[PDB]
Design a protein around this ligand. Sequence first.
Ligand code: NA
Ligand code: NA
Length: 195
Amino acid sequence: ATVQGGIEYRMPLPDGRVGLCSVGFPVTKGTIKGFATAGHCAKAGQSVQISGVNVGTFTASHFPNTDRAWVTIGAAHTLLGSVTNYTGGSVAVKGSTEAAIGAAVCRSGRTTQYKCGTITAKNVTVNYGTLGTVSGLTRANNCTGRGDSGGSWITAAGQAQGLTSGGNLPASQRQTYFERINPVLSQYGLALVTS
Ligand code: NA
Ligand code: NA
């Protein structure tokens, strides 16, 4: 199977239920293949399917306080250093220069597909009720829906920005949040796949 930023992955849960989330960025750890995503999506040990096929398992997850995780992908699968735009194209990943407030950014995920907007605030804390809070999030006004969680945020020029932080699917003025990608890469020791 092919792992690309923004696409759906599925998580087999107990009693035949299935969780849905979106790929953030394909990464390598040494020669290990993987992808970064949201920690709200799963805990370590959660199996992961893409395109109907077992592709890997969550390796680490840190939520709340942060909202980050990464999945180890089996060696037989192909990593694409790009983010799908859901309409036949992709944005090639070039690096992770963090963009400023006001910068144009697009996010990709399986519920609302590819939606674009601008960054409006940084270092925001979001309240998750009984779970506690997540701090340090960047806010933007892009459209988003439940299930986009974990998916890619990238500038058109290809600089990776972050991972959608938001609600799970049950199994400026819009306010949408993402987890910054550079702290995630650093914590887990991950290198972005580029193209
Ligand atoms: Na917190
Ligand atoms: Na590459």
